[PDB]
Amino acid sequence: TGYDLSASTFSPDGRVFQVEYAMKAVENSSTAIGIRCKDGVVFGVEKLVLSKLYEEGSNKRLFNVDRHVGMAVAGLLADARSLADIAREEASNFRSNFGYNIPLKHLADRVAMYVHAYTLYSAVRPFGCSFMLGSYSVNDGAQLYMIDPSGVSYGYWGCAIGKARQAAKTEIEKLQMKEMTCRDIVKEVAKIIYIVHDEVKDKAFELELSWVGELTNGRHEIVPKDIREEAEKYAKESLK
Amino acid sequence: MAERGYSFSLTTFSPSGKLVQIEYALAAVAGGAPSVGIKAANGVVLATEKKQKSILYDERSVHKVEPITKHIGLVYSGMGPDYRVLVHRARKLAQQYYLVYQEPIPTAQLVQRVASVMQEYTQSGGVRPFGVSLLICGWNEGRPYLFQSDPSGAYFAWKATAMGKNYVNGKTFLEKRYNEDLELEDAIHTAILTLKESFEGQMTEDNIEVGICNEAGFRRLTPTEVKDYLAAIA
Amino acid sequence: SSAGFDRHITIFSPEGRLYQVEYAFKAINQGGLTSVAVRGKDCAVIVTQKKVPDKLLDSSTVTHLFKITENIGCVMTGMTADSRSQVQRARYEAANWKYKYGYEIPVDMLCKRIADISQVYTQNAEMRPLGCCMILIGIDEEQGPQVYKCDPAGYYCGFKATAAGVKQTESTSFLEKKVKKKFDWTFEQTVETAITCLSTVLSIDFKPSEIEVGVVTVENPKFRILTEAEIDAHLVALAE
Amino acid sequence: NQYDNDVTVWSPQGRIHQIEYAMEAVKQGSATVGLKSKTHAVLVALKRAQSELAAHQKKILHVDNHIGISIAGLTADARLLCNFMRQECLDSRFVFDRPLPVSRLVSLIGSKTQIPTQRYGRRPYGVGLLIAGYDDMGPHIFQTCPSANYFDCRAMSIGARSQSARTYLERHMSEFMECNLNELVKHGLRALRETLPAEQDLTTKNVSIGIVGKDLEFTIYDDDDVSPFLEGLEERPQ
Amino acid sequence: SRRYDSRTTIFSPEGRLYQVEYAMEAIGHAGTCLGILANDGVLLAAERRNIHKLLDEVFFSEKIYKLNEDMACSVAGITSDANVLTNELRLIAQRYLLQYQEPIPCEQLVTALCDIKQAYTQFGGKRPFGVSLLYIGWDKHYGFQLYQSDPSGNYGGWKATCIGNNSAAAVSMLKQDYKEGEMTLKSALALAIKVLNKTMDVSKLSAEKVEIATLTRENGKTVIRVLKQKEVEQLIKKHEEEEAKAEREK
Amino acid sequence: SYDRAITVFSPDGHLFQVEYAQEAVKKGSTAVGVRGRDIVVLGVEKKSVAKLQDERTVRKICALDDNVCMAFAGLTADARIVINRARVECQSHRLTVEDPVTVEYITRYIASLKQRYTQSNGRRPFGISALIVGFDFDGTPRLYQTDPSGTYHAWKANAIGRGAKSVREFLEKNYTDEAIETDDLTIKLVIKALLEVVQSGGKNIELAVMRRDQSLKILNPEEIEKYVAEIEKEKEENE
Amino acid sequence: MEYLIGIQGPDYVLVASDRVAASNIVQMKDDHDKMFKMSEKILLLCVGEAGDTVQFAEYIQKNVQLYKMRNGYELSPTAAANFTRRNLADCLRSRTPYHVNLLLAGYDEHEGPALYYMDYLAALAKAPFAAHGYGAFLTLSILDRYYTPTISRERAVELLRKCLEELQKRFILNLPTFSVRIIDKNGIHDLDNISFPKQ
Amino acid sequence: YDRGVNTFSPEGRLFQVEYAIEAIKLGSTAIGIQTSEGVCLAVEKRITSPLMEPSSIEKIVEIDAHIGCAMSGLIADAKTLIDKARVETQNHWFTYNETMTVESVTQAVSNLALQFGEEDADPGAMSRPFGVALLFGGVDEKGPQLFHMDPSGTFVQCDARAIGSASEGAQSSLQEVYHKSMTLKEAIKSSLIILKQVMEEKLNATNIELATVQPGQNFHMFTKEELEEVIKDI
Incomplete structure (x- = not known):
């Protein structure tokens, strides 16, 4: 110990422990x-309800960052809300400065660079969130990116974040993502989450659940309630 | 996001009264590759030993001997990146003097100004003291001038000096010679000899970098010229 | 030898050694990857190993080769986020050099400028030294093809052939013998020498998809990233 | 031990200790209860007196005609946030000539709370609030923790002995939407009664009731005004 | 961050400033600097240190500096701090000359640098300037004056004082052999050589090992002449001659 | 610049740094001040003349303004800054609200500067406690004392420095109603306190008395010796 | 408008200032003192603009007094004149310029009597006899005609009276009374005010 | 043991603010009582020696004609807080041509209480929480009112209060003595009885300062000389 106090310190092994501890919070x-x-x-998010008195939509972890982009967040919710605000702002600056909706590849890189900056200095703590950004455009096609607390942005055909990340990705790999239609994919996302929920833990x-695609005309949107519920019914039936 | 950063000096007086961090920076200069400076009556000769670890590295790309201005050159012993920061700073200072006075900077003046930058790091907060000691040479008013600036910022004018591994042996070797009556710079041979005394496997045109400041100005000797001097070196 | 926080911050230590900078070199090796570069008489070639741990990650997104400018390209070995940041800083410095000075940055100068940025990180505490090493390939008139490497410590030099990553002592020696009797390699020979050196040191005999090769040539100055099929033709030729 | 000193430091278990310590400050505080109905929102608070001669410190602070904030934590911190909330509602009225949506204010409050919990030196804010508001969407109650995580809640309780209040609010939550203002306060004061130690009882001096609704601008009823709401109460079931 | 911070200015539980005391110790390690005041003139003589054979000696006296036409100083302590202070002193003198077209009096120059030296001890979490310097000067207001400035920023107007390695021994000889109200720079110069012989462990007081500068008023111009090595040599021989005469008496 | 609090409350509730600053005053040379019916008097001790040293440079009594004067015990360097800062305020007070500076105002200003250093981040507290003696427009003589922390109390007579407690006890016991009077007797009371000072050198103690209707005058060493002779004659009378 | 005259003799400086303060057509104070005592042996008299004169004069006076308190020696008359010149000169190219015409009279133990003439532009010239105001144009020829390098103090007050009389015989401004002061080894001495109610 | 200027206890309040509450305990005891006929404010000067003039010690100050403040703990810290209160009342007069209520003045001083932070923030109020416990008492439109504040910044309205050393002992007696309609005269007498019990020294006129603000009259000047008559009554 004694090398983990600051993110401006490299361990003798050659690692920034403070960033790793931040990634541990995402795992939690x-x-x-x-x-x-x-x-x-x-994107589908498992948000367990700590208190029945919350009215729902409380601590929602799916954010509409831009008209064509949406994010799912895992980690400290407070850190995520700040990141979404940086992402919403970076998108707005692009539309004002260059005149068109930001390419998702650029938005993920610009937000990731901000996440990276926190790790370099002792003054500011490393971020505690690992959000995923997904966008659909007719010109560039559907894109998915996940940015972890280190600042690494990688395009993923399928991705998971959190305690059940390993179980979910293993279930995700079986699905034929490249050819499956988006409406069909929603029922699968519901099933993966229901299996990895843990039930009693x-x-x-x-x-x-959130939908960005040709059906939504290139606008990130929450799944319509009629499309959902039936997806929940399939997931409950599939698990049993 | 942290802006300017730490504002508290990392160098503080010891109970004895000697600054510890400056002493550690001196250790890097001693640990540095050997550098020898000899001032002959016609001109100063600066010689340093560059041994690249492998044939893969291109020796020509980086020069340990650098021209600060037409008549001023610098050789360093210690950490390489820090020497580059000082060399850029010295060139800026020399040009600023020329712009204000329309005359090339006097050799002693560049040393004081470079030394003042080095002292600033010792007193100022956050920054570690520089780990490099330089052997600036110049030819102003005809007379050749050789000076050395330590990491602390103290500057001394030396007819001959050596820094780097086996500096003490180098100083004694120069003490044996260095009559200082050498009107010609045959001290180019003596400088090659002092580096040779502490040299490792061999001395080649690639192994040694030599820069000479004369009435004409500071010119880094061509690799062919270093070979000619290395050849028939007594 | 330890005095105070000599090993915890970038401050000098007894024996005049910056322990934190030495720890940073270990960081480049921490990422499990290696990269090799060879400079031929008419061309310069950079090769890296691309490892996609899970099929879900898009192969295109996982690249350690980036284009600093149309005529300059780089391979990054180290932490991905830190390396991506050094790529942006280099891209910006080249754009400034062209705007301010009117000619594209010489590859020698781009290395010094990125190295100068790195040295300050060591000089001033509050900034971690960085854990990425960059190799730059470009064609400079009157200098032919040139390969340059910037250390985390801020050291820079010109390199006829070099490597960085997990296994570089072996790579430098294998190249050093080949450099001794090279007799000026042709474009095919330069790609072959780099691919073979990586194949032997890793002992993988990797297929075309597993590696990425980027080459800059006197005939075609623009930096080009070879397609997998183009890599395969060179890969079969060495295999024969 | 070393990890506990600063917000910037992250534990090997990846939990920020100073944030948890700031969370404790809310627990060492007077209990407050918020409930909502289809048309009105009530935020009963239990004022605590340092001395019998001393007046109870005021907990419910008016922010705007449509919004009122209860406090359960360091008072000086609440004043800094309460000043920000009054300013934010004023700017919305000045430029957009409309009441700020309550949810949008809670969002601004979180962003301000997050910046200290991250930057070095600055300390986490340590006050727990139970904002109540009426807007086009309708009545709202929002809990804010020192962690900077807001939570939109139909009912809520924060501070010492608050757990007893949460249990009562949860058991009777279904009844809240279909009830008149008097009943909504009556459930809320009953919830404060659970927080109260059994020997102590609710009195006009120790209870503050604040109500915002479709036809009611935020009013901090207190002292004699609280007495009709207190009257008609069933005897405490001790 | 606080953990990587040196207090520098914080008071000791005893109430002394630790860093300033440590800086004073550094002045003790440095070479001897001695000043003697006579009615005709004020003189500063200091001992050159690290006199390696190869040194050029082209700095016209490393220890002595001329702050103004009528004032000079010699410094014992870290050389880098000295260079910063000597440049600052020259600027303060020039700034006074522009604002009021008359030369800075002397105590004003000492106080102005002293204010800077105290400020470093006062605040900023920064290392104190570990240098102690003796100022020799002439002013219309109070004639020839001599001053000593400590790293703390406290200053004194001693007619005779030494701030070098053997200061305690030098002061004791100076107190016994300084004749108050008796001038003659020549007598003061002889006293300086005798103090130097005691302070310097090396015998013979070699001319190269010592530097002597004398400030005198001639034709209302104030001349800070620096004694040539030949002048220093004759003085050392005169001290030896007096020592020889004592041997004859024995 | 550096932005961390040098002085922070300790668990006992005491600002430790301010107590340490007071310790520096305790190590300081003793300074004695008394107020006469018309002549304010202040004196200093431990001149510690080294013969080679010049007394004018080391004087510890200064006139901030014609109306006010000050004596300091504690770190010598810190006092030089505080005295010059007061001199600026006193002249600045004349430029604004034109009039002379009341003695109480100058003591409040010196106290506020001293308090601000304790309540500022990055700066060590001043190590000087001061005796400011002056006559107001009414002509009443006023003497005040400023703590290193920054508290000012009016004092008819007081002393600060090494062995301040012994002199303070001597002053209260030896204090005479009518303030001794006759001017010479008021100066003698300080001279008796100077005899009470541990050195008891005579010439070593140096005191300056302000008429309070004119300007501060330093006692001549021979003049001080004559006053010391008056105290010695009083000792002979006591015998 | 406002009139300042200085006559300097072998060991003394005689300075006279008008005493009239006027706003618009009316004259509102007839006892105005345009002379500010910077130090015991230096006097600065300033004539210029409505508020510029008091602010500049007081700042110079307070600064000159402050130098004495800290240093312990009063500024020489010359240094004070150079110090005042610098402050006016620095403010010349500034948002608030000071339009003040000042003449400084002082006696120094070694230098002896000194009189300095300064314009609003801050050009400082040492002069044997000097004048300011529209009145100076008539009076300065009389001073030039009768001034002798060696002049007794009594002769100077008569010469001041001769010039002051012309300011009534041939001038459009009332200028009824003039304040007279002399500076010598002892210090500033207030000689009787020269007055013309008809006497 | 660096800790921090701003840091939280493992389950509780900021440590430095808690240490500041301790500093008031080492302070002169002050008793403030509010009655329908006015507010009575009393304090113990605790004069250390006969030589110091009693008048110079001030523990009661006039913020405004209708407002006065009793101070405890560190007197030097209160001077900044008192000045701010006086400026705040004066600015309310310039802007509104009306008198600030006692509560508003209390809030303005109360707001400055927690403004200390090492990084950024404001230099004038900084370094530490103010070590003082003011007891503002005044007559406003609502009626006679007395308010108590602590370094934590928590103002409260108190009908009767005791601050400083022996505040707890004074408070216990204050609860018993206070009556639903005590006349101001009864309170002035009751307070001085309590003041004598808590103070170690005798209740001499020099030792105690009592000042009262009443609906009819402005804050009175410490009941000078009339104090002896109230002392004579006990």
Whole structure:
């Protein structure tokens, strides 16, 4: 120990321990999974409800960062809300400065560079969140990226973040993501989350699902309630 | 996001009264590759030993001997990146003097100004003291001038001096010679000899970098010229 | 030898050694990857190993080769986020050099400028030294093809052939013998020498998809990243 | 031990200790209860008196005509946040000539709270608030923790002995939407009664009731005004 | 960060400033600097140190500096701090000359540098300037004056004082052999050589090992002449001649 | 610049750094001040003349303004800054609200500067406690004392420095109603306190008395010796 | 408008200033003192603009007094004149310029009597006899005609009276009374005010 | 043991603010009582020696004609707080041509209480929480009112209060003595009885300062000389 106090310190082994501890907080968070379908991206978040008195939509972990981009967050919710605000702002600056909606590849890189900056200095703590950004454009096609607390942005056909990350990705790999239609993909996302929920380790959870794709006309949107519920029915039936 | 950073000096007086961090920076200069400076009556000769670890490295790309200005040159013993920061700073200072006075900077003046930058790091907060000691040479008013600036910022004018591994042996070797009546710079041979005394496997045109400041100005000797001097070196 | 926080911050130590900078070199090796560069008479070639741990990650996104400018390209070995930041800083410095001075940055100068940025990180505490090493390939008129490497410590030099990553003592020696009897390699020979050196040191005999090769030539100054099929044709030729 | 000193430092277990310590400050505080109905929102608070001669410190602070904030934590911190909330509502009225949506204010409050919990030197804010508001969407109650995580809650309780209040609010949560203002306060004061130690009882001096609704601008009813709400109460079931 | 911070200015539980005391110790290690005041003139003589054979000696006296036409100083302590202070002193003198077109009096120059030296001890979490310097000068207001400035920023107007390695021994000889109200720079120069012989462990007081500068008023111009090595040599021989005469008496 | 609090409350509730600053005053040379019916008097001790040293440079009594004068015990360097800062305020007070500076105002200003150093981040507290003696427009003589922390109390007579407690006890016991009077007797009371000072050198003690209707005058060493002779004659009378 | 005259003799400086303060057509104070005592042996008299004169004069006076308190020696008359010149000169190219015409009279133990003439532009010239104001144009020829390098103090007050009389015989401004002061080894001495109610 | 200027206890309040509460305990005891006929404010000067003039010690100050403040703990810290209160009342007069209520003045001083932070923030109020416990008492439109504040910044309205050393002992007696409608005269007498019990020294006129602000009259000047008559009554 004694080399883990600051993020401005490299361990004798050759690592920044403070960043690793931040990634541990993401691991503590409940799972959020994003899958890239043939026409768009679908994100589903397992948010366990700590208190029944919360009215729902409380601590929502799916954020509409821009008209065509949406993010699912795992980690300290407070850190995530700040990151979404940086992402919403970076997108707005692009539309004002260059005149068109930001390419998702650029938005992920610009937000990731901000996340990277915190690690370099003793003054500011490393970020505690690992959000995923997904966008659908007719010109560039569906794209999914996940940025971890280190600042690493990698494009993923399918991705998961949180305690059940390993279980979810293993279930995700079986799905044929490249050819599956987005409406079909939604039922699969519901099934993966229901299987990785843990049932008794966590209390009852509410499924939050988001749709960005040709069906949504290139606009990130929450899944319509009629499209959902039936997806929940399939997931409950599939698990049993 | 942390802006300017630490504002508290990392160098503080010891109970004895000697600054510890400056002493550690001196250790890097002693640990540095050997550098020898000899001032002959016609001109100063600066010689340093550059041994690249492998044939893969291109020796020509980086020069340990650098021209600060037409008549002023610098050789260093110690950490390489820090020497580059000082060399850029010295060139800026020399040009600023020329712009204000329309005359090339006097050799002693560049040393004081470079030394003042080195002292600033010792007193100022956050920054570690520089780990490099330089052997600046110049030819102003005809007379050749050789000076050395330590990491602390103290500057001394030396007819001959050596820094780097086996500096003490080098100083004694120069003490044996260095009559200082050498009107010609045959001290180029003596400088090659002092580096040779502490040299490792062999001395070649690639192994040694030599820069000479004369009435004409500071010119880094061509690799062919270093070979000619290395050849028939007594 | 330890005095105070000599090993905890970038301050001098007894024996005049910056322990924190030495720890940073270990960081480049921490990422499990290696890269090799060879300079031929008419061309310069950079090769890296691309490892996609899970099929879900998009192969295109996972690249350690980036284009600093149309005529200059780089291979980054080290922590990915830190390396991506050094790529942006280099891209910006080249754009400034062109705007301020009117000619594209000489590859020698780009290395010094990135190295000068790195040295300050060591000089001033509050900034971690950085854990990425960059190798730059470009064609400079009157200098032919040139390969340059910037250390985390801020050291810079010109390199006829070099490597950085997990296994570089072996790579430098294998190249050093080949450099001794090279007799000026042709473009095919330069790609072959780099691929063979990586193949032997890793002992993988890797297929075309597993590696990335980027080459700059006197005939075609623009930096080009070879397609997998183009890599395969060179890969079979060495295999024969 | 070393990790506990600063927010910037992260534990090997990846939990920020100073944030947890700031969370404790809310626990060492007077209990407050918030409930909501289809048309009105009530935020009963239990004022605590340092001395019998001393007046109870005021907990519910008016922010704007549509919003009122209860406090359960360091008072000076609440004043800094309360000043920010009054300013934010004023700017929305000045430029957009409309009441700021309550949820949008809670979002601004979190962003301000997050910046100290991250930057070196600055300390985490240590006050727990129970904002109540009416807007086009309707009545709202929002809990804010020192962690900077807001939580939109139909009912809520924060501070010492608050758990007893949460249990009562949870058991009767279904009844809240379909009830008149008097009943909504009556459930809320009953919830404060659970927080109160059994020997102590609710009195006009120790209880402050604040109500915002479709036809009611935020009003901090207190002292004699609190007495009709207190009257008609069933005897405490001790 | 606080953990990587040196207090520098914080008071000791005893109430002394630790760093300033440590800086004073550094002045003790440095070479001897001695000043003697006579009615005709004020003189500063200091001992050259690290006199290696190869040194050029082209700095016209490393220890002595001329702050103004009428004032000079010699410094014992870290050389880098001295260079910063000597440049600052020259600027303060020039700034006074522009604002009021008359030369800075002397105590004003000493106080102005002293204010800077105290400020470093006062605040900023920065290392104190570990240098102690003796100022010799002439002013219309109070004639020839001599001053000593400590690293703390406290200053004194001693007619005779030494701030070098053997200061305690030099002061004791100076107190016994300084004749108050008796001038003659020549007598003061002889006293300086005798103090130097005691302070310097090396015998013979070699001319190269010592530097002597005398400030005198001639034709209302104030001339800070520096004694040539030949002048220093004759003085050392005169001290030896007096020592020889004592041997004859024995 | 450096932005961390040098002085922070300790668990006992005491600002430790301020107590340490007071310790520096305790190590300081003794200074004695008394107020006469018309002549304010202040004196200093431990001149510690080294013969080679010049007394004018080391004087510890200064006139901030014609109306006010000050004596300091504690770190000598810190006092030079505080005295010059007061001199600026006193002249600045004349430029604004035109009029002379009341003695109480100058003591409040010196106290506020001293308090601000304790309540500022990055700066060590001043190590000087001061005796400011002056006559106001009414002509009443006023003497005040400023703590290193920054508290000012009016004092008819007081002393600060090494062995301040012994002199303070001597002053209260030896204090005479009518303030001794006759001017010479008020100076003698300080001379008796100077005899009470540990050195008891005579010439070593140096004192300066302000008429309070004119300007501060330093006692001539021979003049001080004559006053010391008056105290010696009083000792002979006591015998 | 406002009139300042200085006559300097072998060991003394005689300075006279008008005493009239006027706003618009009315004259509102007839006892105005345009002379500011910077130090015991230096006097600065300033005539210029409505507020510039008091602010500049007081700042110079307070600064000159402050130098005495800290240093312990009063500024020489010359140094004070150079110090005042610098402050006016620095402010010339500034947002608040000071339009003040000042003449400084002082006696120094070694230098002896000194009189300095300064314009609003801050050009300082040492002069044997000097004048300011529209009145100076008539009076300075009389001073030039009768001034002798060696002049007794009594002759100077008569010469001041001769010039002051012309300011009534041939001038459009009332200028009824003039304040007279002399500076010598002892210090500033206030000689009787020269007055013209008809006497 | 560096800790921090701003740091939280493992389960509790900021440590430095808690240490500041301790500093008031080492302070002169002050008793403030509010009655329908006015507010009575009393304090113990605790004069250390006969030589110091009693008048120079001030523990009661006039913030405004209708407002006065009793101070405890560190007197030097209160001077900044008192000045701010006086400026705040004066600015309310310039802007509104009306008198600030006692509560508003209390809030303005109360706001400055927690403004200390090592990084950034404001230099004038900084380094540490103010070590003082003011007891503002005044007559406003609502009626006679007395308010108590602590370094934590928590103002409260108190009908009767005791601050400083022996505050707890004084408070216990204050609860018993206080009555629903005590006349101001009864309170002035009751307070001085309590003041005598807590103070080690005798209740001499020099030792105690009592000042009262009443609806009819402005804050009175410490009941000078009339104090002896109240002392004579006990």
